[PDB]
Write a structure and sequence with these properties.
heterodimer; A: mainly alpha; about 0% strand; elongated; B: 4-stranded antiparallel sheet; about 0% helix; nuclear protein; WDR5; MBD3C; WIN motif
Chain lengths: ~10, ~300
């Protein structure tokens, strides 16, 4: 997908 | 005074989480981007689907309009940016040069330059006409969450997971300013105020801060929302009352009075994290967009 829609841990 | 935004339309069609929504400067259109690799164009006033723009090999984290509403730029996990002619749907340029995902992008007010931020911890400045990289700024030591030009394009503001907000001279590339407050939370968003005198920044400690960039001083704080994981856009709402608008990880849109920092409204109806909001340039219209469990865009209209 996309990094923004995955977020930061 | 308090706004009275109400839901008018819900826009379905993205098959994966929505990443960003932006109104065109002429106020005719809404552009959305998604993890599904697609840009979608919708009517800003009715929400009627206009068209789909494709070509990225991986998901898109950001999309942004040119000043004349003719061009889009998209930033994707395929490590490229793409410049698109909206009317014809053509990819006019593919900006290669980042070595990791591209997270954020914007045009300058002239729209002869594009700024990009990447997981490779750099900020890049690209020439719109040729698609060639003009400058690579070693901006940060962690992924860059946002980039934005000021009103005349002489200044670029960037934010990063490293907790820093930095101001760069577009022409020269030197770091003019580094901004950080008492703690070191990751900075998930930043943007200049419409007059260019302030920058609004989001940190992953449930906080929005309005900064006077010249004095290096935090002027306002906005709290009460949930922001700890996601790079959520925030906006200045100026068509009616002067508000600060932001999505939230509790699935609501939050609207604060800019001066009093009071929450004046919460918009309910999304079923996942509200990752993105945008404000229409002439009408009191908010567009909001949410993550994988929701996949929709919502338009809200108010009287002030």
């Amino acid at each position: 997908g996309a990094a923004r829609s995955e977020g930061f841990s | 005074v308090k706004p009275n935004y109400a839901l008018k339309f819900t826009l379905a069609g993205h098959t994966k989480a929505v990443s960003s929504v932006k109104f065109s400067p002429n106020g005719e259109w809404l552009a959305s981007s998604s993890a599904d690799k697609l840009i979608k164009i919708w009517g800003a006033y009715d929400g009627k689907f206009e068209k789909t723009i494709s070509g990225h090999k991986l998901g898109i984290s950001d999309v942004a309009w040119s000043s004349d509403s003719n061009l889009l730029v998209s930033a994707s996990d395929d490590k490229t940016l793409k410049i698109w002619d909206v009317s014809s749907g053509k990819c006019l340029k593919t900006l290669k040069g980042h070595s990791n995902y591209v997270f954020c992008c914007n045009f300058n007010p002239q729209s002869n330059l594009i700024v990009s931020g990447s997981f490779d911890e750099s900020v890049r400045i690209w020439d719109v006409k040729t698609g060639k990289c003009l400058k690579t700024l070693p901006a940060h030591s962690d992924p860059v969450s946002a980039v934005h030009f000021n009103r005349d394009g002489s200044l670029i503001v960037s934010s990063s997971y490293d907790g820093l907000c930095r101001i760069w001279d577009t022409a020269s590339g030197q770091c003019l300013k580094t901004l950080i407050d008492d703690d070191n939370p990751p900075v998930s968003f930043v943007k200049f105020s419409p007059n260019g005198k302030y920058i609004l920044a989001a940190t992953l400690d449930n906080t929005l801060k309005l900064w006077d960039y010249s004095k290096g001083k935090c002027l306002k704080t906005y709290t009460g929302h949930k922001n700890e994981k996601y790079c959520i856009f925030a906006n200045f709402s100026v068509t009616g009352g002067k508000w600060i608008v932001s999505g939230s990880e509790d699935n609501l849109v939050y609207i604060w009075n800019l001066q009093t920092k009071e929450i004046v409204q919460k918009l309910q109806g999304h079923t996942d994290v509200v990752i993105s909001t945008a404000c229409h340039p002439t009408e009191n219209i908010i567009a909001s967009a949410a993550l994988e469990n929701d996949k929709t865009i919502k338009l809200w209209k108010s009287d002030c």
